[PDB]
Amino acid sequence: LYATFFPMAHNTASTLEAMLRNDTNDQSFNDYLSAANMLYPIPANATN
Amino acid sequence: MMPQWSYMHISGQDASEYLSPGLVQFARATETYFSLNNKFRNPTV
Amino acid sequence: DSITQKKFLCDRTLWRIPFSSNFMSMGALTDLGQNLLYANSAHALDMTFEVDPMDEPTLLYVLFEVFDVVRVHQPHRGVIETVYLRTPFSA
Amino acid sequence: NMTKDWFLVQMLANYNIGYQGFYIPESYKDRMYSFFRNFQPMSRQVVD
Numbered sequence: 001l002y003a004t005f006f007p008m009a010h011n012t013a014s015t016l017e018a019m020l021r022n023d024t025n026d027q028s029f030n031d032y033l034s035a036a037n038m039l040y041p042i043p044a045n046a047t048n
Numbered sequence: 049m050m051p052q053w054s055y056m057h058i059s060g061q062d063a064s065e066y067l068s069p070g071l072v073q074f075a076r077a078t079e080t081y082f083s084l085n086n087k088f089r090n091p092t093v
Numbered sequence: 094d095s096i097t098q099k100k101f102l103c104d105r106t107l108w109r110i111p112f113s114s115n116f117m118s119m120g121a122l123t124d125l126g127q128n129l130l131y132a133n134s135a136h137a138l139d140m141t142f143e144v145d146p147m148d149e150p151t152l153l154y155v156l157f158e159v160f161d162v163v164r165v166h167q168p169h170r171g172v173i174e175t176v177y178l179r180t181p182f183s184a
Numbered sequence: 185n186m187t188k189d190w191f192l193v194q195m196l197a198n199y200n201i202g203y204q205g206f207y208i209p210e211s212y213k214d215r216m217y218s219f220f221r222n223f224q225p226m227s228r229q230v231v232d
Contacts, residue, residue: 019068021168024068027087036179036182042150042152044148058178
Protein backbone atom coordinates (compact mmCIF):
# COMPACT_ATOMS: atom_id res chain seq x y z
CA LEU A 1 0.00 0.00 0.00
CA TYR A 2 1.48 3.35 -0.99
CA ALA A 3 0.56 6.70 0.48
CA THR A 4 1.93 10.15 -0.30
CA PHE A 5 1.87 12.93 2.28
CA PHE A 6 2.08 16.65 1.50
CA PRO A 7 5.11 17.76 3.60
CA MET A 8 2.92 20.28 5.42
CA ALA A 9 4.45 22.57 8.04
CA HIS A 10 3.79 20.95 11.43
CA ASN A 11 2.24 24.00 13.09
CA THR A 12 -0.08 24.29 10.09
CA ALA A 13 -1.00 20.59 10.01
CA SER A 14 -1.78 20.79 13.72
CA THR A 15 -4.14 23.74 13.25
CA LEU A 16 -5.92 22.09 10.32
CA GLU A 17 -6.32 18.91 12.36
CA ALA A 18 -7.91 20.71 15.31
CA MET A 19 -10.42 22.38 13.00
CA LEU A 20 -11.28 19.15 11.20
CA ARG A 21 -11.92 17.24 14.41
CA ASN A 22 -14.96 19.47 14.95
CA ASP A 23 -18.23 17.77 14.02
CA THR A 24 -19.21 21.12 12.54
CA ASN A 25 -16.37 20.67 10.03
CA ASP A 26 -17.15 17.02 9.33
CA GLN A 27 -16.31 16.03 5.76
CA SER A 28 -19.10 14.55 3.63
CA PHE A 29 -19.40 12.82 0.27
CA ASN A 30 -21.97 11.29 -2.06
CA ASP A 31 -21.64 8.48 -4.58
CA TYR A 32 -21.60 10.00 -8.05
CA LEU A 33 -24.04 7.56 -9.67
CA SER A 34 -26.26 8.08 -6.60
CA ALA A 35 -28.80 5.34 -7.16
CA ALA A 36 -30.41 2.15 -5.92
CA ASN A 37 -29.63 -0.50 -8.53
CA MET A 38 -32.20 -3.14 -9.49
CA LEU A 39 -32.05 -5.92 -12.08
CA TYR A 40 -35.23 -7.53 -13.42
CA PRO A 41 -35.30 -10.70 -15.56
CA ILE A 42 -36.65 -10.58 -19.10
CA PRO A 43 -37.24 -14.13 -20.34
CA ALA A 44 -36.41 -14.85 -23.97
CA ASN A 45 -39.00 -13.48 -26.38
CA ALA A 46 -40.84 -11.66 -23.59
CA THR A 47 -42.09 -8.17 -24.45
CA ASN A 48 -43.98 -6.86 -21.45
CA MET B 49 -37.47 15.25 6.31
CA MET B 50 -35.66 18.55 6.96
CA PRO B 51 -33.56 17.18 9.89
CA GLN B 52 -31.66 14.42 8.09
CA TRP B 53 -31.48 16.58 4.95
CA SER B 54 -29.61 19.44 6.66
CA TYR B 55 -27.30 17.23 8.72
CA MET B 56 -26.38 15.25 5.58
CA HIS B 57 -26.18 18.48 3.56
CA ILE B 58 -28.79 17.31 1.04
CA SER B 59 -30.47 20.61 1.82
CA GLY B 60 -29.60 23.75 3.78
CA GLN B 61 -26.49 25.95 3.68
CA ASP B 62 -23.33 25.58 1.61
CA ALA B 63 -19.87 24.77 3.01
CA SER B 64 -18.86 28.44 3.10
CA GLU B 65 -21.75 28.89 5.53
CA TYR B 66 -21.70 25.80 7.73
CA LEU B 67 -17.93 25.32 8.02
CA SER B 68 -16.28 27.23 10.85
CA PRO B 69 -15.07 30.67 9.68
CA GLY B 70 -11.53 29.60 10.52
CA LEU B 71 -11.60 26.58 8.21
CA VAL B 72 -13.15 28.61 5.38
CA GLN B 73 -10.35 31.12 5.87
CA PHE B 74 -7.68 28.43 5.82
CA ALA B 75 -9.32 26.78 2.82
CA ARG B 76 -9.18 29.86 0.59
CA ALA B 77 -5.63 30.63 1.72
CA THR B 78 -4.20 27.24 0.67
CA GLU B 79 -6.51 26.54 -2.27
CA THR B 80 -3.54 26.85 -4.66
CA TYR B 81 -1.27 24.19 -3.18
CA PHE B 82 -3.60 21.96 -1.13
CA SER B 83 -7.32 21.71 -1.93
CA LEU B 84 -10.18 20.93 0.47
CA ASN B 85 -13.06 21.70 -1.92
CA ASN B 86 -14.11 18.16 -2.77
CA LYS B 87 -14.31 17.17 0.91
CA PHE B 88 -17.43 19.15 1.82
CA ARG B 89 -20.72 18.98 -0.07
CA ASN B 90 -22.85 21.93 -1.18
CA PRO B 91 -26.51 21.04 -1.65
CA THR B 92 -28.46 22.41 -4.61
CA VAL B 93 -32.21 22.68 -4.20
CA ASP C 94 -40.47 -0.74 -55.87
CA SER C 95 -39.11 -0.11 -52.41
CA ILE C 96 -40.03 0.15 -48.76
CA THR C 97 -38.37 2.50 -46.25
CA GLN C 98 -37.12 1.44 -42.81
CA LYS C 99 -36.07 3.92 -40.10
CA LYS C 100 -34.33 3.22 -36.81
CA PHE C 101 -31.78 4.64 -34.42
CA LEU C 102 -28.92 3.52 -32.25
CA CYS C 103 -27.96 5.10 -28.92
CA ASP C 104 -25.08 3.25 -27.28
CA ARG C 105 -23.27 3.89 -24.00
CA THR C 106 -25.93 6.09 -22.43
CA LEU C 107 -28.82 5.62 -20.02
CA TRP C 108 -32.45 6.50 -20.72
CA ARG C 109 -33.46 9.16 -18.22
CA ILE C 110 -36.75 10.29 -16.72
CA PRO C 111 -36.12 13.02 -14.13
CA PHE C 112 -38.61 13.42 -11.27
CA SER C 113 -38.93 17.14 -12.07
CA SER C 114 -42.21 18.97 -12.77
CA ASN C 115 -40.86 20.16 -16.10
CA PHE C 116 -38.19 17.48 -16.63
CA MET C 117 -35.52 20.17 -16.28
CA SER C 118 -32.51 20.16 -13.97
CA MET C 119 -33.08 22.96 -11.48
CA GLY C 120 -31.23 21.38 -8.58
CA ALA C 121 -30.10 17.99 -7.24
CA LEU C 122 -33.01 17.92 -4.79
CA THR C 123 -35.81 18.10 -7.37
CA ASP C 124 -38.95 20.15 -6.92
CA LEU C 125 -41.22 17.08 -6.97
CA GLY C 126 -38.85 15.38 -4.55
CA GLN C 127 -39.75 18.16 -2.11
CA ASN C 128 -43.52 17.99 -2.64
CA LEU C 129 -45.47 17.38 0.59
CA LEU C 130 -47.46 14.80 -1.37
CA TYR C 131 -44.38 12.55 -1.44
CA ALA C 132 -43.24 13.46 2.07
CA ASN C 133 -46.21 13.14 4.45
CA SER C 134 -47.32 9.77 3.07
CA ALA C 135 -46.12 6.58 1.37
CA HIS C 136 -47.00 5.36 -2.13
CA ALA C 137 -46.66 2.20 -4.18
CA LEU C 138 -45.12 2.35 -7.65
CA ASP C 139 -45.88 0.36 -10.77
CA MET C 140 -43.80 0.49 -13.92
CA THR C 141 -44.45 -1.32 -17.17
CA PHE C 142 -41.83 -1.58 -19.88
CA GLU C 143 -42.56 -2.75 -23.41
CA VAL C 144 -39.42 -3.84 -25.27
CA ASP C 145 -38.43 -5.52 -28.53
CA PRO C 146 -38.20 -9.29 -28.06
CA MET C 147 -34.78 -10.97 -27.97
CA ASP C 148 -34.27 -14.71 -28.35
CA GLU C 149 -32.19 -14.94 -25.16
CA PRO C 150 -32.50 -14.04 -21.47
CA THR C 151 -31.96 -10.34 -20.77
CA LEU C 152 -32.23 -8.00 -17.81
CA LEU C 153 -34.01 -4.70 -17.25
CA TYR C 154 -31.56 -2.49 -15.36
CA VAL C 155 -33.45 0.21 -13.49
CA LEU C 156 -31.56 2.93 -11.67
CA PHE C 157 -33.67 4.59 -8.98
CA GLU C 158 -31.92 7.95 -8.52
CA VAL C 159 -31.62 9.02 -4.91
CA PHE C 160 -29.14 10.59 -2.49
CA ASP C 161 -26.35 8.27 -1.38
CA VAL C 162 -24.48 10.30 1.23
CA VAL C 163 -22.06 9.88 4.15
CA ARG C 164 -20.84 12.24 6.86
CA VAL C 165 -17.46 11.40 8.39
CA HIS C 166 -16.42 12.36 11.92
CA GLN C 167 -12.85 12.09 13.29
CA PRO C 168 -13.21 13.26 16.95
CA HIS C 169 -9.97 11.79 18.28
CA ARG C 170 -6.69 10.40 17.00
CA GLY C 171 -7.38 6.99 15.50
CA VAL C 172 -11.16 7.42 15.48
CA ILE C 173 -13.50 7.48 12.47
CA GLU C 174 -17.28 7.55 12.82
CA THR C 175 -19.52 7.57 9.77
CA VAL C 176 -23.21 8.28 9.36
CA TYR C 177 -24.63 6.87 6.14
CA LEU C 178 -27.89 7.98 4.64
CA ARG C 179 -29.56 6.92 1.44
CA THR C 180 -33.02 8.28 0.62
CA PRO C 181 -35.35 7.33 -0.64
CA PHE C 182 -34.74 3.57 -0.45
CA SER C 183 -32.91 3.70 2.89
CA ALA C 184 -30.68 0.78 3.89
CA ASN D 185 10.74 1.17 -15.66
CA MET D 186 10.26 4.73 -14.37
CA THR D 187 10.41 5.13 -10.57
CA LYS D 188 7.61 6.29 -8.27
CA ASP D 189 9.84 9.13 -7.02
CA TRP D 190 10.56 10.46 -10.50
CA PHE D 191 6.96 10.17 -11.73
CA LEU D 192 5.86 12.09 -8.63
CA VAL D 193 8.45 14.84 -9.08
CA GLN D 194 7.63 15.39 -12.75
CA MET D 195 3.89 15.48 -12.15
CA LEU D 196 4.35 18.02 -9.35
CA ALA D 197 6.92 20.11 -11.24
CA ASN D 198 4.72 20.27 -14.37
CA TYR D 199 1.15 20.31 -13.00
CA ASN D 200 1.22 20.43 -9.19
CA ILE D 201 -0.36 16.98 -9.32
CA GLY D 202 0.76 14.32 -6.84
CA TYR D 203 -0.12 14.97 -3.18
CA GLN D 204 -3.83 14.47 -3.72
CA GLY D 205 -3.95 11.78 -6.36
CA PHE D 206 -2.67 11.06 -9.85
CA TYR D 207 -4.80 11.96 -12.84
CA ILE D 208 -4.50 13.29 -16.37
CA PRO D 209 -3.81 17.06 -16.22
CA GLU D 210 -6.10 19.54 -18.00
CA SER D 211 -5.09 19.56 -21.66
CA TYR D 212 -4.61 23.34 -21.62
CA LYS D 213 -1.77 22.78 -19.15
CA ASP D 214 -0.44 19.60 -20.78
CA ARG D 215 1.11 21.28 -23.81
CA MET D 216 3.29 20.03 -26.65
CA TYR D 217 6.55 20.09 -24.69
CA SER D 218 5.06 18.87 -21.39
CA PHE D 219 5.89 15.63 -19.62
CA PHE D 220 2.56 13.73 -19.60
CA ARG D 221 1.63 14.48 -23.22
CA ASN D 222 4.91 12.83 -24.25
CA PHE D 223 5.18 10.04 -21.67
CA GLN D 224 5.07 6.68 -23.49
CA PRO D 225 5.49 3.51 -21.37
CA MET D 226 6.01 0.24 -23.31
CA SER D 227 6.45 -3.50 -22.76
CA ARG D 228 7.14 -6.59 -24.85
CA GLN D 229 8.09 -10.22 -24.44
CA VAL D 230 11.03 -11.98 -26.06
CA VAL D 231 12.20 -15.58 -25.94
CA ASP D 232 14.04 -16.43 -22.74
